[PDB]
Amino acid sequence: GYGYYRTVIFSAMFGGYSLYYFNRKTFSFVMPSLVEEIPLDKDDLGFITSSQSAAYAISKFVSGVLSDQMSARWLFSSGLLLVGLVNIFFAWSSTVPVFAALWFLNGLAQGLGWPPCGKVLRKWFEPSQFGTWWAILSTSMNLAGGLGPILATILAQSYSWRSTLALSGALCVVVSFLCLLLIHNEPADVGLRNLESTLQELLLSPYLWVLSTGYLVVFGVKTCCTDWGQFFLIQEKGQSALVGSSYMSALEVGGLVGSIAAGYLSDRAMAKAGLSNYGNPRHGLLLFMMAGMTVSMYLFRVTVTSDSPKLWILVLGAVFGFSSYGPIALFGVIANESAPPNLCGTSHAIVGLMANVGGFLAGLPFSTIAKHYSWSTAFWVAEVICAASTAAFFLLRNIRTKMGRVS
Amino acid sequence: GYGYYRTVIFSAMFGGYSLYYFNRKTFSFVMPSLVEEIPLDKDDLGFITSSQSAAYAISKFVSGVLSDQMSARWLFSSGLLLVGLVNIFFAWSSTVPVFAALWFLNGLAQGLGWPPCGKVLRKWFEPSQFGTWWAILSTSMNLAGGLGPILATILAQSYSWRSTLALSGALCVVVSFLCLLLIHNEPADVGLRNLESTLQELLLSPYLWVLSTGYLVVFGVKTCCTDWGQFFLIQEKGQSALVGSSYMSALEVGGLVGSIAAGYLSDRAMAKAGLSNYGNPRHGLLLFMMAGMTVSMYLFRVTVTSDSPKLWILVLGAVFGFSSYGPIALFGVIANESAPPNLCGTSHAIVGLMANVGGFLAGLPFSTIAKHYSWSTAFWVAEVICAASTAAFFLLRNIRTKMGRVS
Known part of the structure; x- marks a missing residue:
């Protein structure tokens, strides 16, 4: 069966x-x-x-x-x-x-x-x-x-x-x-019913690289927040080490529930729609979650003090974890799904190479900006890049998502 | 006197x-x-x-x-x-x-x-x-x-x-x-009262390059619309040659009144404010006009048919000319104004080199996208780049605009 x-x-x-x-x-x-x-x-x-x-x-x-x-x-x-x-x-x-x-x-x-x-x-x-x-x-x-x-x-x-x-x-x-x-x-x-394109027809499709730069930005912002939110709460927000570690654990638990919620609600959005080749019904909540990263890093950057309690820290950790590990799951979903059937893994690999590029960008230049200017300037540059790519991907939500040949 | x-x-x-x-x-x-x-x-x-x-x-x-x-x-x-x-x-x-x-x-x-x-x-x-x-x-x-x-x-x-x-x-x-x-x-x-920084202190200031990429995008979108709006009205919007030429003349007259209005209202915004070094009171209307380019190219891309009259064509030409030649004047204003006194012209030249880069980007790749995909896809890519940079510059409106040394 x-x-x-x-x-x-x-x-x-x-x-x-x-x-x-x-x-x-x-x-x-x-x-x-x-x-x-x-x-x-x-x-x-x-x-x-x-x-x-x-x-x-x-x-x-x-x-x-x-x-x-x-x-x-x-x-x-x-x-x-x-x-x-x-x-x-x-x-x-x-x-x-x-x-x-x-x-x-x-x-x-x-x-x-x-x-x-x-x-x-x-x-x-x-x-x-x-x-x-x-x-x-x-x-x-x-x-x-x-x-x-x-x-x-x-x-x-x-x-x-x-x-x-x-x-x-x-x-x-x-x-x-x-x-x-x-x-x-x-x-x-096993004898059940299944459910032509070349590699240059995948690479010359613009949705692969729009998806790759969106995943680049989302993974770089995830990686800079995951690697340096501890130090951002220690040094520029006056929180102790236990609050920073519990903020990371709130970001991880929120990330698990946000990955599962992104998958389930994007499949609900895909079941309700899906008649056209332009656009993607998973964009309608991928953009909700990229705006969630924007609102989360803003309400974590300006509305976190040394006097704001641990409840707001845990809520903002859970909401940014939600809104961040959701989109990484969704960029994987779309890099495998909006690809041709024989160019699926190639599309997912070209998207996942931007994880390596964004991990380097969140390691060395993010710590460089955080060492020269300040931590809040660096995390604000991360919030700017994430919100600018949120807006750019809200614009580019209606490019031809189904990649490969055009016929 | x-x-x-x-x-x-x-x-x-x-x-x-x-x-x-x-x-x-x-x-x-x-x-x-x-x-x-x-x-x-x-x-x-x-x-x-x-x-x-x-x-x-x-x-x-x-x-x-x-x-x-x-x-x-x-x-x-x-x-x-x-x-x-x-x-x-x-x-x-x-x-x-x-x-x-x-x-x-x-x-x-x-x-x-x-x-x-x-x-x-x-x-x-x-x-x-x-x-x-x-x-x-x-x-x-x-x-x-x-x-x-x-x-x-x-x-x-x-x-x-x-x-x-x-x-x-x-x-x-x-x-x-x-x-x-x-x-x-x-x-x-003549003996009147006037009104230290080096070149590496200008080049390492991030506002010069944020201003340069904003001017790159605004000049590229201006140049692609100015060079190919005639053909976009001829071929994909069903308008005659007289309507396309009068649309260009409406964009030019709107551009003159928009440059003058950007200068005058940005000086009104500068007189009312100007106590801090972060931000710029000219951004508060530079962003109005970049959003005007966004709304103008959207209402010219989707709400222009072969049946929509010449009045809407002239109004949208005047409003995009307003909203486009305003910002080019304002990026010149800020590249001369937010610079050090002995690094003013160097800052304006580094910004104005992005006019050459954006003019090339609006000449060859814009006509390349308009030849391969369609004209509306190309002008929509221009609208996406302009609106994404509108949002990115609305984010980056509060970086340290006064360039040079930090003291």
Whole structure:
């Protein structure tokens, strides 16, 4: 049955990508037991994590381009098998360049997880339900990030880092063998009905780059607020460290509920409409949430003092988390959905490369502006870029969203 | 008397820059008598005019940078003496490379006219009256453009192109000798009271480049509408050639009244305010007029048919001309006004180089988008860029407008 296959393939892909995001950050999760066992440096740890970041940028791009050509089930379970072999070799490693090289290989293999998920969600799930199941699979990412450090500290208190990370890699190998048999990349695999364009017809479509610059701005504003809202509450808003950490936790909880709400309400907006090729019924709430980022960063910049209570801090953290992790889910939804069927993952990779560009823009120039001028000037520049792109995307909401050839 | 010097120096500079803009386009003005006398090609004529355009781009930049170092009266009357010597040599010329080289030298010498006007208006006129006298000197430019072809056709019907252009150059020589003695570049020349920063302190100020990108967008949208609104009414709006030409004349008359209204009402807004260094009281109506460009191009794009009358065409032409030539005057006003006193012309030149960039963007990529997609898609991309920069400049209205050092 078609719904039985939707349930089974998405549950296997749910557990699979939870294992993916758990083993994208396992060295981050079991970091205290490893630095108790063997000594490292701060710059050495940063080199390992930056090697993963560079390899995972390259691998998101290469895996998005390759997921259109080769199948999704083999690319998915081969990525999880490579992650498992990497963690098996990593737990039995002792010297620092072997740590850095194997974690570079894990950065290469973590990219092979999500564009197969994008191809499966593209060919299986209807556009009237694509956003909410996309949001539940990003909730699998968030569930891995939640249950990661807790049970990681449990298994690092019970067993060592070698045993925990080796059993995690062996679990990736087992879930790879048991998720190769439980992903079908199209409904035409089991005999069900499915639901021509080239790459230059995707790249010359303006909606890919409007979507990419909107995702660039939204991810850069998300990343600068996520990385420096703690210091913005410490230094220019007079709040303590507990209020800044609880503001980050409010932004994360609001981000989970905002990703799920963006998916579900954008699928409600897609079911009620969808007769024309120009425009997108997901823009009608993507713009609500980008205006929510505007109103949220304004009411967090000018209406936060040292005397305004923690309730307003938590409310504004939840509303900016809502209004920010919603659009990142929606730019992923549209980069997979408004693309041609054989140019879906390429479109999502070209959009997701702007995550790397915006992460660099929120790391070095945002901290540069916050060091030279002030923190409020830097976060206000972020609010200006986000609100100007909110207005620009409200203008550009009615370009030809369905990409590829024009006929 | 201080007001007597304001009147006399501005009247001499008024007649001077009228002679400047009349002799910037005299070969364009007396073009029919010259093509009756000697034969040319369309690409030859285009090479002459493009040589002037390139030399005048280079000369606006070099003259703006040089007007801060050397005096304004000598640079001004030396520019007018060079224009006069060029036209004296040009009227007595016969061969095509001499035409192109002398008109290149006129392109080099027309740049030497306006940054001395900017320095004189900067040091003489108060910021509570700077915009309206700036607008009257741009009205001198428009008066030269109005009385140019009319009396040019009169003097080309009476005398030849040689006699007319030679008497025009001799009038530039006479007005140069009689305007060197009637421009004082500071009130400290005659003993009146006047009204430290470096170049890297100007270039690293963000308001110069926010102002430059706003002027880039406004001049590109002005230039694409001015160059292609005729064809947009011919081809996609069903209007005849007379309605398109009268729409352009309505945009020009509206542009003159909008430049003067921007200057006068921005000086009224400057007199009523002006206590802080952040923000600019001219932004409060520069944003009204950029929103006027937005509303004007929207109500000209979607509420113009083949059945909507010529009254709505003329009203929308006047309102977009208002709302477009207002801001170009105001970006000049602010590029001269919000700059340091010894970095005024450099700031105006760095802003005015974006006129060259936006003129190229409205020439080749705008016609490229209008050839590939449609005319309404191209003008809608122009409306999107103008409205997105309207919103971005409404955000950025409160950056530190006073440029230079921070103390």
